[PDB]
Structures are given as C-alpha cells and as structure tokens.
Amino acid sequence: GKECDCSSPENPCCDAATCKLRPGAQCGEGLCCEQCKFSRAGKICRIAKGDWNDDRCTGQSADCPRYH
Secondary structure, three states, rough: OOOOOOOOOOOOOEEOOOOOEEEOOOOOOOOOOOOHHHHOEEEEEEEEOOOOOEEEEEEOOOOOOOOO
16 A cells, blocks of 8 residues: 555554564464464465355465455
C-alpha cells in the first residue's frame, strides 16, 4: 500500500517508526503470518463452507485468497 506493513503499533513485526515490517521477520499481519515469519505453504487460512478442498497458503505469502 503506502509505507506500512502492519496496522498495530504493539505488533512485534513492524518498525513502529516507519509503520513497516521489522527487517528480520517476513510478515507483520496476515491469515498465514507466523510469528514474524512467512508461514509455509499448505497452511489452512480458512475452511470451505460444506465439504471439499480448503484454503491453503503458499510458502512465500502471508495472506489468504478465497475459493469457497
């Protein structure tokens, strides 16, 4: 977006000075953002709405799209 990677100032994954991520982790907030680290693919970011495939995250992303 602009120059920020997180939305919380207390979050330990984004320099509060530049409201951006902290140069050490790889995600300040997302459906698949591990403790300051890019979650690994095969991450269930959300469950379908009945009975079928589920939502999985990649090995380099920190958010989750939609498929159900």
